[PDB]
From a paper:
EnpA is a prophage encoded 1721 residues protein composed of three domains; the N-terminal domain (1350 amino acids) shares homology with phage tail tape measure proteins. The two domains located towards the C-terminus of EnpA are homologous to domains belonging to PG hydrolases with lytic transglycosylase activity (cleaving glycan chains) and M23 peptidase activity (cleaving PG peptides). Members of the M23 family are metallopeptidases containing a zinc ion in their active site, coordinated by two histidine and one aspartic acid residues in the conserved motifs: HXXXD and HXH.
Despite multiple attempts to crystallize and solve the EnpACD structure, we were unable to obtain crystals of the wild-type protein diffracting below 4 Å; therefore, we generated an inactive variant of EnpACD H109A. The crystals of this variant gave better diffraction data that were then used to solve the structure of EnpACD at a resolution of 3 Å. All EnpACD molecules in the ASU are similar with root-mean-square deviation (RMSD) values of 0.35 Å–0.65 Å and β-factors for chains A–E ranging from 87 to 108 Å2. A central β-sheet creates the bottom of the active site groove while its walls are restricted by three out of four protruding loops, as loop 4 rather sticks to the protein core.
Author numbering: 2 to 131
The structure:
């Protein structure tokens, strides 16, 4: 996983990427890490902030960071966004605060890997890149 997420404490992984338990029903498009609302989200990989959105839908408050030539890391369900568009960010820079914005049951951060663009196709962060 060349761009797998490596959140430390207090982030705890809850729902994996891909088809959920059983053979029918839902498909998680990223990896959910649980943590209290307000927990600062440190960026996993350096890149350019080229996508910021506030909505009450799906990922809700989220940022996209271009972390590779054709790969964008998305950090979602924020309670507060702290990156501005154009920001060059380093790994471990705090890009936001955990929330439950959008379509999330409780407090967690949704890490999604997209190819083709900030609204592009999602991939498996655990496996993409090796
Ligand atoms: Zn999710």
């Amino acid at each position: 996983g060349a761009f797998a997420p490596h959140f430390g404490s207090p982030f705890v992984r809850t729902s994996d990427y891909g088809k959920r338990p059983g053979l029918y029903g839902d498909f998680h498009t990223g990896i959910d890490y649980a943590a209290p609302t307000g927990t600062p989200i440190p960026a996993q990989y350096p890149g350019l902030v080229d996508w910021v959105q506030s909505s009450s839908i799906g990922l809700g408050e989220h940022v996209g960071i271009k972390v590779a030539d054709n790969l964008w890391a998305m950090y979602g369900h924020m309670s507060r966004i702290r990156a501005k568009m154009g920001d060059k960010v380093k790994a471990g820079q705090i890009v936001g605060d955990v929330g439950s914005s959008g379509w999330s049951t409780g407090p967690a951060v949704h890490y999604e890997l997209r190819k083709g663009g900030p609204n592009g196709q999602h991939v498996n962060p655990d496996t993409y890149g090796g």
